Design a protein around this nucleic acid. Structure first.
Ligand SMILES: [Mg+2]
Ligand SMILES: [Mg+2]
Ligand SMILES: [Mg+2]
Ligand SMILES: [Mg+2]
Ligand SMILES: [Mg+2]
Lengths: 136, 74, 104, 177, 53
RNA sequence: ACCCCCGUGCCCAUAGCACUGUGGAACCACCCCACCCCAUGCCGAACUGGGUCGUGAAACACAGCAGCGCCAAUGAUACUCGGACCGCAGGGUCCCGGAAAAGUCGGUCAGCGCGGGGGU
RNA sequence: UCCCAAAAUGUAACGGAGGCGCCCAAAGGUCACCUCAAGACGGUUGGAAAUCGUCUGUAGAGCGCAAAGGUAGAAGGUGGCUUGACUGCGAGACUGACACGUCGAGCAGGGAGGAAACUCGGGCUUAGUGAACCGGUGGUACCGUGUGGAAGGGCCAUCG
RNA sequence: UCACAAGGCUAAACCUUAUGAAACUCCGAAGGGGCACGCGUUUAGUCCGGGAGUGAGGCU
C-alpha cells in the first residue's frame, strides 16, 4: 500500500501496458480497460471487498503496488514552492495491465467478486481465462 | 533550489571525417569518454586536442574504450 | 603480478616515439632479447642466447646484448628503446643493456 | 631441521596403497603464518614492543604490525591504527619454529590430548588454536610481563584435508583421542 | 584569496643575491618550520630561496 | 615446406570460465642452493642472484567438450519523421517510410601476422 | 554537481535534490614497486564487524570534500630522490554581447626524477571566489616642472 | 542503485515466479547536430561602414 523509502516526488505521462501479463498466479484475472491512477485505497477497497466475498478464498493476488507520490495545494495560492509531500500514493495502470488475479474459488465466485471489485475503481475493467503462456 | 544555472559546455567539438588543424580541440569531456590516438594530446581536464593537422576520424572499440585519431591529409 | 609486463609495455609509446622497441625475455637461463618494430607486425633484428652460449649462464648477458648490437647495426638502428617484462634492472638485464647500447 | 623425513616416508605412504602420480604431486608445506591478535579490546602502544619482543625472540625473525581496514563499525575502530602483529615463516626459519613447537611446545600444553582433527581448510590447508604463550621452550615465566597468546596458520599444497591430516601427523601432529 | 584571523598564510619569497617572489600558499598547520625551496631569480637560477619572511 | 615450441602483435568474450585428456629433457615451469649485487614497512614467497638432478605434479602450452557465460537472426511488435484525424480530458486511430529492446531459430568454444628455437 | 533538458549545444520556474568560500610540504614532480569491497571454511583478546590464512572476486572498493563522468595496463595503495606549486613566451582552438573564463603543442633560460624513451609551467577532472579605484611592501632605475640631485610619480612583483 | 508482488529456503542473503523508475540503465530508435560532396534544384550568404527600432508578447 505505502512505500517505506524513496526519492519523494514525481511527474506524469502515459502509454500502453507493459508490465503485466494477461494471466499469472491463478485462474482468473482482472484487467484495466483505461489508463489512470489507482490510489492506496481503491485497492485496499478492492482487496477488502474481494476478500469480504470469499473468506478462506484463499488466493487474492494484487499485482498492482502504488508508488507514485502525488501532492496537493495545502490551503492556497502560488506564492511558495511545490508542496504536499504526503498527499496520496497512486500506482499507474494502463490497458492489459492485470491488477488483480484470484484462484481457489469457483468460476462464479470469481465472476461476482470481480463484479463487486468493478465499482470502487476509477476505471472500466473486465475478466478473462488463460490462453497464453509467455515465460514461466 | 535550483542553484546551478551555468552550462559548462562539453559535447564533441570536432567530429569524424572532419578536416582539423593543429591545436584544435576535438573534444571536451568529463573523464576520458574516449582516449587519445595518434595525432592527439590531452590536457588536464582531459579534452582531446590536436598535435598535428589532418583528418580527424573516430575509432569506436568494444563499448567503452573509444578513440579519436588524426590521419594524414597531404 | 602479471600487470608488471602490461604496465612496462603500455608505458613505452608505440607510435608517437618513432623509435623501435627492443624487448627482452628473461625466463630460464635461456633468454630472448628480440627487437621489434612498433607498428608493422614485423620484427627488425632479434638476436638471442637461445642455443649454445657455451657454459655462460647469466654472464652471457653481455654477449647476447653484444651480438644484438652488432646484428642491429646490420639493418641500422637509431636509439631503439628498452622494453622489459616484469624483470627490472641491475645485474642480469642491465648487462644486456650495457652491451647492446654502447655496442652500437 | 629434518627435511629428510619430509621427503621419503610421507610421500610413498600414499603411493604404496592407493597409488599416486608423481613425487611432486605429494603435498608439501608452503609457509607457517604467525598472527598475533592484539589491539581493539586490548590495545597497548607500550606492549606493542612487548609482543614484538617475544615474537622476535621465538621465531628468529622480526614481526610486522598490521593496520585497521579503513573501517569504523560501532565500537572502537578507525581508518588505521595497529590492530595486531604478523610474522611470516618460510624455508629454514619455518622449520626452525615448527620443530621448536612440535618437538617441545606441542607435548607441553594444559590438558593436552591433541589439537582438533576435524577439517580446517577445506582446500587442504591447516589452522591452529594456540592459546598460551608460556607453553613454549622459547617462552617461560622466568622472564615475562603479562599473559597473552598467539595464532598460527599452516599452508600446504595438499588438495584435500585427507591429504592434510596424514601429512601433518607424521611431522608430529597429535590428534584428539 | 580571502583572508582573516585564520591559519596557513601566503608568503612569497626571498634569497641570496636574487630579489624575487614566488608568491606561494604556505601552511603553519601540519608542518611549518622552514618555508625553504629552490628557485630562479635574475641569475643563472640554480639558487635556494628561503621563504620564511 | 610441414609439426611444434618461446617471444611478440593485430583482434581487444561467436576469442572467457568450468570440466578436463595429452605434453618434459628441445623450449617453459616449479623445485635447487644464496654470505654476497639486489631486495624484503616481516619473510628471497615477490623482486633478485648461482644451477642441475627431479618430476610435468602446480603453472603455462595444446586438444576434446557447447553445462555457464558471449554473440545472436526471420517474423511480429514498441516507438517515431512526415501526412491526415478522434475524444471535454486522461488519452487514442489512419496513411506513409524509418524501426528497435527482449525473446525464440541459431551460432561458437576464435581468427589473422612477425621473428627466433627445436623436430620429420 | 545531477534531474527537469524533448538521445547536438543551449534553455525558464518562490521547479525537484546536494555541495563551495577549502585543503594537501606532500594529497605536488618523477621513479620504483603494490591491487580493492564483499562472501564462505578455520583460528589466541574473537564468537555481526576486528587481526591472520585458504577460496571466490572487472570493481560490487578506493579516489581529501557535493555529485556526475572517469577510472584495474591507475587516476587508486607504499617508498626513494626531490621543489616544473618555475622565469621569458605563446601555434592553434573551445566559450562568452562584452569583460572574464578554459585547453594548449612547440621555443629559450635553466633545473627534477629516470639507466632509458621521456614526463614536469601544482594537484582524475569539474566549486575553494572578486573588475576598477585608492593605498602597504620588495625590486627597478623610465619621468622629475632652469640645471645636478632629492620629494612625488612610473614600470615588475606583489599585500589590503 | 532505490522501490516492490507471491512462493520456496534455514531476517539480509539465496532460488522459482512477478513488477516500478525525472534524478536506475544490459540495451536503444525514429529524429537532431557537425563535417565533406553535389553527384542536384534553387537563391541567399559573408565582410566593411551610416541610420534604426525592439528588449510587455499572445494564442494553438
Ligand atoms: Mg504525427
Ligand atoms: Mg542536452
Ligand atoms: Mg535536443
Ligand atoms: Mg571611483
Ligand atoms: Mg515567451
Amino acid at each position: 500500500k505505502r512505500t517505506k523509502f524513496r526519492k519523494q516526488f514525481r511527474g506524469r505521462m502515459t502509454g500502453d501496458a507493459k508490465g503485466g501479463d494477461y494471466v499469472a498466479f491463478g485462474d482468473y484475472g482482472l484487467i484495466a480497460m483505461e489508463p489512470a491512477w489507482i490510489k492506496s485505497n481503491q485497492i485496499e477497497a478492492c482487496r477488502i471487498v474481494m476478500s469480504r466475498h470469499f473468506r478462506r478464498g484463499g488466493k487474492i493476488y494484487i499485482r498492482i503496488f502504488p508508488d507514485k507520490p502525488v501532492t496537493k495545494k495545502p490551503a492556497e495560492t502560488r506564492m511558495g514552492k511545490g508542496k504536499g509531500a504526503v498527499e496520496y500514493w497512486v500506482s499507474v495502470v494502463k490497458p492489459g495491465r492485470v491488477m488483480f488475479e484470484v484462484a481457489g474459488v469457483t468460476e462464479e465466485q470469481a465472476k461476482e467478486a470481480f463484479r463487486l471489485a468493478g465499482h470502487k475503481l476509477p476505471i472500466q475493467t473486465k475478466m478473462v481465462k488463460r490462453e497464453v503462456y509467455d515465460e514461466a | 533550489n535550483g542553484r546551478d544555472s551555468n552550462p559548462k559546455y562539453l559535447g564533441v567539438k570536432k567530429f569524424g571525417g572532419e578536416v582539423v588543424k593543429a591545436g584544435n580541440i576535438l573534444v571536451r569531456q568529463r573523464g576520458t569518454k574516449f582516449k587519445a590516438g595518434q595525432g592527439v594530446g590531452m590536457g588536464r581536464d582531459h579534452t582531446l586536442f590536436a598535435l598535428s593537422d589532418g583528418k580527424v576520424v573516430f575509432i569506436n572499440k568494444g563499448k567503452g574504450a573509444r578513440f579519436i585519431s588524426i590521419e594524414a591529409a597531404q | 603480478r602479471r600487470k608488471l609486463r602490461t604496465r612496462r609495455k603500455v608505458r613505452t609509446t608505440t607510435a608517437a616515439s618513432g623509435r623501435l622497441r627492443l624487448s627482452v625475455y628473461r625466463s630460464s637461463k635461456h633468454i630472448y632479447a628480440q627487437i621489434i618494430d612498433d607498428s608493422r607486425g614485423q620484427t627488425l633484428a632479434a638476436a638471442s642466447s637461445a642455443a649454445l652460449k657455451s657454459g655462460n649462464k647469466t654472464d652471457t648477458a653481455a654477449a647476447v646484448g653484444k651480438a644484438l648490437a652488432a646484428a642491429a647495426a646490420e639493418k641500422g638502428i637509431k636509439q631503439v628503446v628498452f622494453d622489459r617484462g616484469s624483470y627490472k634492472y641491475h645485474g642480469r638485464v642491465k648487462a644486456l643493456a650495457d652491451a647492446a647500447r654502447e655496442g652500437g | 631441521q629434518l627435511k629428510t623425513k619430509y621427503n621419503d616416508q610421507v610421500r610413498p605412504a600414499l603411493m604404496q596403497q592407493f597409488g599416486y602420480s608423481s613425487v611432486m604431486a605429494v603435498p608439501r608445506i608452503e609457509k607457517i603464518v604467525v598472527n598475533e591478535g592484539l589491539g581493539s579490546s586490548k590495545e597497548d602502544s607500550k606492549a606493542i614492543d612487548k609482543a614484538a619482543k617475544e615474537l622476535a625472540l621465538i621465531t628468529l625473525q622480526k614481526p610486522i604490525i598490521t593496520k585497521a581496514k579503513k573501517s569504523i563499525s560501532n565500537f572502537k575502530l578507525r581508518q588505521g591504527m595497529p590492530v595486531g602483529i604478523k610474522v611470516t615463516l618460510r624455508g629454514e626459519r619455518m622449520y626452525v619454529f615448527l620443530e621448536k613447537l612440535i618437538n617441545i611446545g606441542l607435548p607441553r600444553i594444559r590438558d593436552f590430548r591433541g589439537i582438533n582433527p576435524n577439517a580446517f581448510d577445506g582446500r587442504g590447508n591447516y589452522n591452529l588454536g594456540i592459546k598460551e604463550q608460556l607453553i613454549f621452550p622459547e617462552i617461560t615465566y622466568d622472564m615475562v610481563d603479562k599473559t597473552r597468546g598467539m595464532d598460527i596458520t599452516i599452508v600446504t599444497t595438499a588438495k584435500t584435508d585427507e591429504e592434510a591430516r596424514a601429512l601433518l601427523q607424521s611431522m608430529g601432529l597429535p590428534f584428539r583421542k | 584569496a580571502k583572508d582573516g584571523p585564520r591559519i596557513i598564510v601566503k608568503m612569497e619569497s626571498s634569497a641570496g643575491t636574487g630579489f624575487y617572489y614566488t608568491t606561494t600558499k604556505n601552511r603553519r598547520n601540519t608542518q611549518a618550520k622552514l618555508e625553504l625551496k629552490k628557485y630562479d631569480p635574475v641569475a643563472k637560477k640554480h639558487v635556494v630561496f628561503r621563504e620564511k619572511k
